[PDB]
Amino acid sequence: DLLVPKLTASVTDGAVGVTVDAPVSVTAADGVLAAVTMVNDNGRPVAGRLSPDGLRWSTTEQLGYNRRYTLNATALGLGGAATRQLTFQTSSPAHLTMPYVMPGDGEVVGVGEPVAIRFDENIADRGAAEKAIKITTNPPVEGAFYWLNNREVRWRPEHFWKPGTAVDVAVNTYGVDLGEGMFGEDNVQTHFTIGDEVIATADDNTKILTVRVNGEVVKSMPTSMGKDSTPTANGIYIVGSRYKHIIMDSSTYGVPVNSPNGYRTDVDWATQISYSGVFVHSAPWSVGAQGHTNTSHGCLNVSPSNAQWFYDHVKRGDIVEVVNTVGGTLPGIDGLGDWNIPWDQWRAGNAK
Numbered sequence: 001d002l003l004v005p006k007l008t009a010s011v012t013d014g015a016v017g018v019t020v021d022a023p024v025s026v027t028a029a030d031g032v033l034a035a036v037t038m039v040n041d042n043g044r045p046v047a048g049r050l051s052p053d054g055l056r057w058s059t060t061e062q063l064g065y066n067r068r069y070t071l072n073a074t075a076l077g078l079g080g081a082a083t084r085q086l087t088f089q090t091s092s093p094a095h096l097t098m099p100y101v102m103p104g105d106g107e108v109v110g111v112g113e114p115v116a117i118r119f120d121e122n123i124a125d126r127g128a129a130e131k132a133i134k135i136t137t138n139p140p141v142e143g144a145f146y147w148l149n150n151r152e153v154r155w156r157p158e159h160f161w162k163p164g165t166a167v168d169v170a171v172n173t174y175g176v177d178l179g180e181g182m183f184g185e186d187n188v189q190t191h192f193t194i195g196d197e198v199i200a201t202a203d204d205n206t207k208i209l210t211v212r213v214n215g216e217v218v219k220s221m222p223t224s225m226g227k228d229s230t231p232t233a234n235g236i237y238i239v240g241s242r243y244k245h246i247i248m249d250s251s252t253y254g255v256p257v258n259s260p261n262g263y264r265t266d267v268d269w270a271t272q273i274s275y276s277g278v279f280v281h282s283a284p285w286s287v288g289a290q291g292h293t294n295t296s297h298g299c300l301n302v303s304p305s306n307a308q309w310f311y312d313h314v315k316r317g318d319i320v321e322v323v324n325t326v327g328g329t330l331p332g333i334d335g336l337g338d339w340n341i342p343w344d345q346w347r348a349g350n351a352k
């Protein structure tokens with residue numbers, strides 16, 4: 001006839017390994033919730049909120065790893081009253097890993113910019129990490145994950161972004177088992193926008209670096225690329241950081257300075273385009289060979305004014321394409337060579 005109220009929680013009494021990637025909630029049937037408290041092992045209460053109709057209570061703040069929580073709830077209805085007490089334990093990680101996402105929040109980047117999520121620890125379960133990363137695009141475009149190394153995963157579409165696209169990255173790793181008892185230390189979120197299409201093409205046959213903005217040629221720079229014994233790899237490069245001046249140190253990229261292809265020299269107006277250490281930069285010493293002969297260690301050498309032009313007008317995520325050199329092809333897992341991996345292979349990924 002008149003039923004007693006019933007209490008249902010999203011955890012159960014005695015549960016262990018409860019993941020903290022989601023709130024805890026309680027629902028009343030045949031009655032309303034009169035009070036709900038949740039405390040940790042130390043008696044400290046957890047913040048929560050009861051819905052206005054009295055039917056549903058939920059935690060509202062982050063739940064902690066390695067905690068024993070006690071939930072007390074009372075429901076009242078015309079049929080009488082019901083009270084329950086539940087204790088559960090949350091996940092106890094063996095390790096925590098912190099994600100770091102690029103590009104930065106609010107940035108405007110070029111059409112070649114991948115989403116990058118780098119953890120500070122090796123990820124045993126790549127599939128769990130990919131599943132925990134939510135990418136929103138507008139206009140919507142399909143994309144896919146691919147791992148550069150054990151710690152950094154990249155996401156991009158099949159073709160270069162459409163200018164004007166919003167990209168939203170929710171790395172929702174808090175409470176997620178990323179393998180072997182390694183859980184996400186925190187969530188991170190970033191949002192960025194794709195700007196103009198900027199593609200600069202260096203053609204060894206002509207020795208010209210041509211900059212096209214939304215398809216229109218805006219600059220033609222005589223360049224000197226890698227001499228035969230240190231060639232510039234062909235392929236697609238993503239623009240990385242830019243520097244007013246920087247000491248280029250070959251040992252940074254694996255080559256002892258004191259070795260025959262080593263070097264250590266202060267350089268102006270330098271835009272990095274590969275982790276292997278290719279840059280567009282000012283080369284006053286080879287102005288005469290630019291547009292004619294390859295003389296560099298791999299860099300795209302241009303005039304000082306053209307290098308400053310490049311610094312001022314080309315942004316992170318814009319594209320440099322190198323063609324017809326005697327080099328090989330830039331490795332797809334360079335760090336900035338993601339677009340050299342064919343789409344079918346990128347889309348199949350490497351989560352295992």
Ligand SMILES: *[C@@H](O)[C@H]([C@@H](C)O)[C@H]1C[C@H](S[C@@H]2CCN(C(C)=N)C2)C(C(=O)O)N1
Pocket residue numbers: 248249263264265276277278279283285295296297298299300301
């Ligand atoms: C690009 O080619 C690189 C490297 C970071 O990939 C740098 C290294 C040089 S330094 C070279 C030796 C001394 N040089 C002079 C004449 N000052 C040039 C470089 C290059 O121009 O070859 N660029």
